[PDB]
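chain below, 428 aa
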Amino acid sequence: PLPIQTFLWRQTSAFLQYEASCVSFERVLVEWELVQAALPHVLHCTATLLSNRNVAETKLLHTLHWMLLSMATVELFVFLFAPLVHRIKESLVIWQPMWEHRQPGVSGFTALVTYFDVAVLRCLLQPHWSEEGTQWSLMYYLQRLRHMLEELSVVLKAVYLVLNHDISSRICDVALNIVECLLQLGVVPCPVSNHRLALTMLIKIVKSLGCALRHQVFRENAQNCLTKLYKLDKMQFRQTMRDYVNKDSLNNVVDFLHALLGFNVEGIIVSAMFKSLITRCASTTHELHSPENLGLYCDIRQLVQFIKEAHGNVFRRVALSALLDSVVNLGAIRQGMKRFQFLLNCCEPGTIPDASILAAALDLEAPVVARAALFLECARFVHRCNRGNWPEWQKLQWNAAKLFYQWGDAIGVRLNELCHCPFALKMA
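prediction:
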């Protein structure tokens, strides 16, 4: 550096005059340490002018090409020029390989400590950057990973840190393919755990492909990847899933579940996650009843019905948690009753406990208090239905009567058989 550096700034203040400055801009460089000091300004000016296009273009292109044929310099180069690749279309050692997402052939940073690769990786961590440059860097790492597998944790971290901001079909394709390739390389072993990161990436990718041909193949491949990841770190899989469900917002969780199912990997996921999903939902009812989220609430209905429809034997285990999860533990029972109350007020009044469960609830080897609470909660539900206020949403009204009568018949039969547990439970 020298006191002359102000001159360079004076040139930049023309681009940030349009014709005149290029003259000295060329001359001073055409006529090495000064050249190193001047390179960043050359980059800024040439990139700005080239992007302002919807003779100076050619002169500055030739200047840059002569300039190219320290880390911050290549960082800046990629940061500004990566999105321009598709726009510099006709006019080569750099541009022709770069259209193909390969290392540009210039010896300054094609060198190995890899310099271009570390530069682009460092740039990809930036939160705000051109979408085109992000696609380009992703395709570049896809190509490089494919080559590496033909014959890295920070790569995963970069993919994760980009994935959260936004996704597009192109992004989901490239991201799934890269993650699959790193799994094949075996970056995950057989703070932040690698397994957690990978699973989060899969979840986020699959969150935006709700299926209620092009999508079908990609979904199949995603499912295959999920199965592959499944065999690795079983307990960690369960734990991280249970963490994520509570972590992310309800909207995200429900959307992801819809995408996965649409209304085994899915069986394990559901049986690991549904308890925590219901537990979180339980202490949210007042907020969720608010009309702005009504539609969201509606969705949950379907979801729960599907879990009951033919999938979840776990549904019984969650609904009856209050007395399967057992001085008495008052808190566990209270949580179980919150879950049961939420489920009972959710769907198909009089469907959730079947007659058989209630009839057998007399002899279950669980704390009497929990059984009595279950009976009283059923009682309160029936009373509310009778008084007029059903769940805030008909043939269902007539349907519920048969379910109630079935409950009554079952309970009466059981009581008769037994008499012909304490008295208080019978009274409940």
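The CA atoms of residues 112 and 428 lie 78 Å apart. The chain is about 70% helix and 0% strand.
thats it, cya
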